[PDB]
Design a protein around this ligand. Structure first.
Ligand SMILES: O=c1ccn([C@@H]2O[C@H](COP(=O)(O)OP(=O)(O)O[C@H]3O[C@H](CO)[C@@H](O)[C@H](O)[C@H]3O)[C@@H](O)[C@H]2O)c(=O)[nH]1
Ligand SMILES: O=c1ccn([C@@H]2O[C@H](COP(=O)(O)OP(=O)(O)O[C@H]3O[C@H](CO)[C@@H](O)[C@H](O)[C@H]3O)[C@@H](O)[C@H]2O)c(=O)[nH]1
Lengths: 425, 431
């Protein structure tokens, strides 16, 4: 089998970038990204893409209108396509499909998503594959062009392996055969689920150590360095923070917990639950340190769940902000890429009285008792801190929840700041 | 400044012995004296049969022994003679035999604030206290010591502290690059070692938890672990599902971490790390249950072969070995065990399982003697010899139906051969 036309149902953070790179690497393949949201689809064909992703616009504009298309005409793209990506929806596929088509699930949860889709297709010639994304937001384009591995799951039948290899053929345009893993549908789903849980666990583990460091007068970045030098552990994903965010980590871990309880594995359920427990603890612990240090205007720098994205889903900034609002604080929030109205939505009255969304970081710190850094945006370490201290109410506090002001502690102290940082007394 | 010319090590064990042998080997100008109250052990060090099995140790020991490496029971003399004293109540004996400037260095991971307690004694009576935890793993101790990922040295941030720290750095710099040596304060060094072992143990419990999920859902844990391991942010090491981790350090370190957290009023951090131990104990009970269940829910007076008693391969160490627990779980159900391990001494196995041992336990000289007339064979240690055994011969003299319980994934790739021979193979992380 040969794939010549690809439809993707979902023009989001996964759907959008993935297809843009596919169209970019496979000029012979016509890629049509479709969405019910016309506002989003228009923004894709606009010069201002609906999502911020470094290098995406360049990639999109390279192949757009040539082999990459963004449309709201869903039924047509489904009918036209040889492979349908999914980033109840299986029903709309059936109504507009004839003959042989490959239906591929990219989303991590629900856990047995591909198994449920295949269930519908039998209740009515479609092939169901599992192909989870491994890209992280902020580095999506770089991850998609050179991934650590590609994971494709399909039935161990002649028709299943035929569809699997048809999808492998697409990736082999730019991904080495050595990096592509093929397996059954479930092993692929379980593998993605477990991988994200291992990743989230690393953060909770180093965050738990950061609490131990604050309590004992050690430095978590010093400890993390020593831990990271063991090649059996590795040096990546050991950066202590206010807490992990994103649409996937907490959702995946919780879905893992539910599967375990569904399978009568309560110890495995309690084992992975601790990853979430520790994360929520780290957040409460950080907010408490802020309230406690302030015996009031507060500047919140960074609202995205990580840098280089406008995504705010499950961002620790949301929780820290809400924890302070519940104590009656007046917040001034700045984020370089997060849209104003998204911040308002996230915090909902209470928002009307307490929350102000600033256009620039200096506007936010103007007349603030304290500045709280929740997202590791690079611009934050290059700000004029003498200028900020100037227009700040005194005593002026800095709460660094991302360790971005490291190396500036001497400068900031002599300026007149009282700096509080995660994982350090 | 300062130069170290004589080193005494109080402790001739798995850490003390190999460490000093490599130091003497790399620093011919330094006289290294390993001392112990146990004369039997000290004699064994000067004997052609070293008291511990460690690949390449005898070659290293015999290279520098009697030249700059010495094993003695004369503790007080070696302490008095030494510029640096290694420790692998003992600070009292150091004081009684020390004068002037000496550096006292703690190598043991727990008690958590060991170096802080030693320093406390020295002030209650010119000694410098350092922290220098080992990072070697047993079985690969010599290879780890000659090329470690990093060396960690902790000392006081005082002029005298940094002078002692750099004096110890000077020793390692004979064969360890400056780029791999980390210097910090005493506590940050102690905490770093404690946390590192906890991260390592956690990786095993995490992959073991997934192995349970695989058995329940018909996935393969080695397939899953491969996919996880290809992410460079996670890494591919320490992702081997097993019956459970053992060793003197992992459970002890994690439990000591839990106690420190509760002592510091951090109960959530305590419960977070406790799960690493909970999962490990679970994996063990789960494996033993799978054995009892596969044998018609009764193993009383049924002969069972236990292959491997060491907590890992290439060592004779049995401390906290999962083999101990699986063995005891089966003995409690009345099974007759035949235990074989290539390097674990017979009497150590007997001690570990204590009557009950007299009636149920037999220690075999070779693996075929153990499987002779057994209903089931249980592989608990990943010894390389186990994958190269004559399995047609074993099936021959085995009571039938013959079961194989592979708790280390060492019989992978042999499943086809073993099934056609007539075995029913049960393996961890696979339905
Ligand atoms: O050392 C670290 C690394 C990350 N984080 C935080 O953890 C969260 C997750 O970040 P990241 O994993 O980089 O972003 P995601 O886009 O959520 O990526 C994850 O989720 C994706 C969608 O499922 C997967 O494809 C990726 O493999 C997986 O890394 C973010 O809030 C980070 O700030 C830390 O606190 N410390
Ligand atoms: O992927 C793996 C790796 C190890 N293990 C088991 O975990 C236990 C620990 O083994 P290992 O860590 O290899 O041996 P140790 O001699 O206990 O070494 C540990 O303990 C030492 C003393 O603190 C440290 O210096 C080392 O860095 C640390 O690895 C053993 O039972 C292994 O079989 C697994 O089950 N799966």
């Amino acid at each position: 089998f040969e794939i010549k036309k690809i439809c993707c149902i979902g023009a989001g953070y996964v759907g959008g970038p993935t297809c843009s790179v596919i169209a970019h690497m496979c000029p012979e393949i016509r890629v049509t990204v479709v969405d019910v949201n016309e506002s989003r689809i228009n923004a894709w064909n606009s010069p201002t893409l609906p999502i911020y992703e470094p290098g995406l616009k360049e990639v999109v504009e390279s192949c757009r209108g040539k082999n990459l298309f963004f449309s709201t005409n869903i039924d047509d793209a489904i009918k036209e396509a040889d492979l349908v990506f999914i980033s109840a929806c299986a029903r709309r596929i059936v109504q507009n499909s004839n003959g042989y088509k490959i239906v591929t699930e990219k989303s991590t949860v629900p856990v047995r998503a591909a198994e449920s889709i295949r269930r519908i297709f039998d209740a009515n010639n479609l092939q169901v594959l599992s192909n989870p994304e491994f890209l992280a937001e902020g580095t999506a384009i770089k991850d998609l062009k050179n991934p650590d591995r590609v994971l494709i799951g399909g039935d161990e039948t002649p028709e299943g392996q035929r569809a699997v290899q048809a999808l492998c053929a697409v990736y082999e345009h730019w991904v080495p055969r050595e990096k592509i893993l093929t397996t059954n549908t479930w092993s692929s789903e379980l593998s993605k689920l477990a991988a994200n849980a291992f990743l989230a666990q690393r953060i909770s583990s180093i965050n738990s150590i950061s609490a131990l460091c604050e309590a004992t007068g050690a430095d978590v970045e010093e400890v993390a360095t020593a831990i990271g030098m063991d090649q059996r552990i590795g040096n990546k994903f050991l950066k202590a923070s206010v807490g992990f965010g994103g649409s996937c980590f907490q959702k995946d871990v919780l879905n893992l917990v539910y599967l375990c309880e569904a399978l009568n594995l309560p110890e495995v359920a309690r084992y992975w639950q601790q990853v979430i427990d520790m994360n929520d603890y780290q957040r409460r612990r950080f907010a408490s340190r802020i309230i406690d240090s302030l015996f009031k205007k507060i500047a919140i720098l960074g609202f995205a769940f990580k840098k280089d994205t406008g995504d705010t889903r499950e961002s620790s900034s949301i929780y820290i902000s809400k924890y302070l609002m519940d104590e009656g604080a007046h917040l001034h929030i700045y984020d370089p890429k997060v849209p104003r109205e998204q911040i308002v939505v996230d915090l909902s009255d209470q928002v009307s009285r307490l929350v102000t969304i600033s256009k620039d970081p200096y506007e936010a710190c103007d007349g603030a008792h304290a500045v709280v850094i929740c997202t590791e945006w690079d611009m934050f370490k290059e700000l004029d801190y003498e200028r900020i201290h100037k227009k700040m109410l005194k005593p002026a506090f800095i709460f660094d929840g991302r360790r971005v002001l490291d190396g500036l502690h001497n400068e900031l102290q002599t300026i007149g700041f009282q700096i509080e940082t995660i994982g350090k007394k």
